[PDB]
Design a protein around this ligand. Sequence first.
Ligand code: A1BO1
Ligand code: ZN
Length: 139
Amino acid sequence: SGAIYVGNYRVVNRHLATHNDWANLVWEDSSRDLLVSSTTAQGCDTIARCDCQTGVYYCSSRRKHYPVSFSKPSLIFVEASEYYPARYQSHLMLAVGHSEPGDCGGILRCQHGVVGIVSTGGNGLVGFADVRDLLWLDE
Ligand SMILES: Cc1ccccc1CNC(=O)N1CCC[C@H](C(N)=O)C1
Ligand SMILES: [Zn+2]
């Protein structure tokens, strides 16, 4: 679990969105596993606007932060799950690092701010949904 709170927006994994997220829907994209809802309170987070390929992520299944080198956002095949059929997930970045399904929502950050959130993984890999291209989150 986990979310990004920037301005009057809450960014969550689309597969973990609540009934309240859907009732306050701003934008969603199944191919990216992202959903953004509106908030009444002002958020605590800053979004990175950069091309960093290193950063640090929070891993809830270890209660620890880990440094990672990750690939640029790209189109990657993801096997069928209970949430989605087998498909290509877009804007996904992979890195070597521990992850389990409940780690989805953990933030990846570089020195410029929030880069993305955990969305997939397994076998010593962790995959992050990028948010750096969503320039509208800042206004
Ligand atoms: C092993 C692991 C580690 C971290 C996260 C997930 C997993 C394994 N489940 C998994 O990949 N999916 C279920 C949740 C939604 C995911 C998606 N983006 O399509 C697909
Ligand atoms: Zn950066």
